[PDB]
Design a protein around this ligand. Structure first.
Ligand SMILES: Nc1ncnc2c1ncn2[C@@H]1O[C@H](COP(=O)(O)OP(=O)(O)NP(=O)(O)O)[C@@H](O)[C@H]1O
Length: 213
């Protein structure tokens, strides 16, 4: 049962700006998305100070990076607060207008694309390295949904009947551009994290498939 929606025109233009930009340091997308994940963890951490049962859906607090070389997919999963169905429809598409106008203007004045997070639209930095993205999410006391976009004019939101259960949190599935498959590599991923994400309150886990010989 696939609900369709349309992007606000601003978000669609931000999505087209980023998915096209020629930019040298495209690796900063990873700092942005780990930064979101850290924020989403902060928020479940807060609720669990008041109410510790909130952590029972997924007791470990982590950020986890899962290269899927078979599918040319990089997955970024956190055990954060997660997002409701309505959250997905508004937080992604249908909102964010404030930061996006400011940011498009700062760029025309010379701003470095790496400053996108100061305007709080760093999520869309993912399109530096990807042309398709799925967002899977599960908030305590609500069901698991998946949100999907092609950087175009519509996005779907649909109940999640095909993915591993998150327990609680959010997982981004980046369909990497063909020029950008370096970000599936264990060494590459190690460099960017230690370079850009040294001060993260939570363990950053990298998942490596290694053949036994
Ligand atoms: N990994 C994630 N886990 C949970 N919610 C997320 C995640 N990434 C994005 N979101 C939600 O989607 C919105 C879009 O992200 P972005 O456009 O980068 O906003 P932000 O205001 O910089 N993020 P934050 O400081 O993490 O609340 C956020 O405000 C969150 O509400």
């Amino acid at each position: 049962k696939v609900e369709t929606h349309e992007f606000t025109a601003e978000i669609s233009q931000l999505m087209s700006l980023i998915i096209n930009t020629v930019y040298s340091n495209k690796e900063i997308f990873l700092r942005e998305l780990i930064s979101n994940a850290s924020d989403a963890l902060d928020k479940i951490r807060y609720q669990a100070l008041s109410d510790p049962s909130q952590l029972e859906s997924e007791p470990e607090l982590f950020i986890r990076i899962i290269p899927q070389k078979d599918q040319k997919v990089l997955e970024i999963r956190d055990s954060g607060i997660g997002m409701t169905k309505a959250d997905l429809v508004n937080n992604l598409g249908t909102i964010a207008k404030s930061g996006t106008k400011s940011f498009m203007e700062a760029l025309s004045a010379g701003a470095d694309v790496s400053m996108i997070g100061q305007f709080g639209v760093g999520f869309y930095s993912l399109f530096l390295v990807a042309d398709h993205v799925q967002v899977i999410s599960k908030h305590n006391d609500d069901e698991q949904y998946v949100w999907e976009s092609n950087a175009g004019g519509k996005f779907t939101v649909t109940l999640d009947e095909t993915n591993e259960r998150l327990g609680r949190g959010t997982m981004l599935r980046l369909f990497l551009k063909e020029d950008q498959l370096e970000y599936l590599e264990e060494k590459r991923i190690k460099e960017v994290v230690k370079k850009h994400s040294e001060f993260v309150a939570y363990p950053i886990q990298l998942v490596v498939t290694k053949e036994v010989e």
